[PDB]
Amino acid sequence: YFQGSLRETSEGVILSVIVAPNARETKIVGIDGTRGRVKVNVAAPPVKGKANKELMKFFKKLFGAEVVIVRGETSREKDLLIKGITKKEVIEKLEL
C-alpha cells in the first residue's frame, strides 16, 4: 500500500520518497515498509540538482499539480509536497 508513504496537511499531500539516481528510467519501483517511503528510480545524475529536478518533473506530470521538495534536498530521503491535492487523488494516481 502507498498509504504508508503519504499524509495530507492543510496545503496538500506530503509524499515521502527514497530516491536512487542514475537509473534507466524515472519510475516507482517499490515501497519501503519500514521507512514508510516510495522507492523512486530517477533517470538523472545526482549533480547540480538534476535528480531533484527530474523527480519533481515526474510527479508534477503524474499528479497535475505543483510539487516541491520540502525536506531532503541533499538526501536520498525526500519529502515532496504535492500542492492542493487530496490523499485520495494521490492514491488513485500512484495506483495507475
Residue type at position 50: K
The one segment of 4-12, 41-49, 64-72, 77-85 that binds Na ion by CB under 5 A: 41-49
Least distance from Na ion to the Cβ atom of residue 57, Å: 12
Residue 41 lies near Na ion (rule: CB under 5 A): no
Rg (the chain; Cα; Å): 12
The one segment of 4-12, 25-33, 51-59, 64-72 that binds Na ion by CB under 5 A: 51-59
b/e code 22-40 from CB counts within 10 Å (16+ = b):
ebeebeeeebeeeeebbbb
Binding site for Na ion (CB under 5 A): 46, 49, 51-52
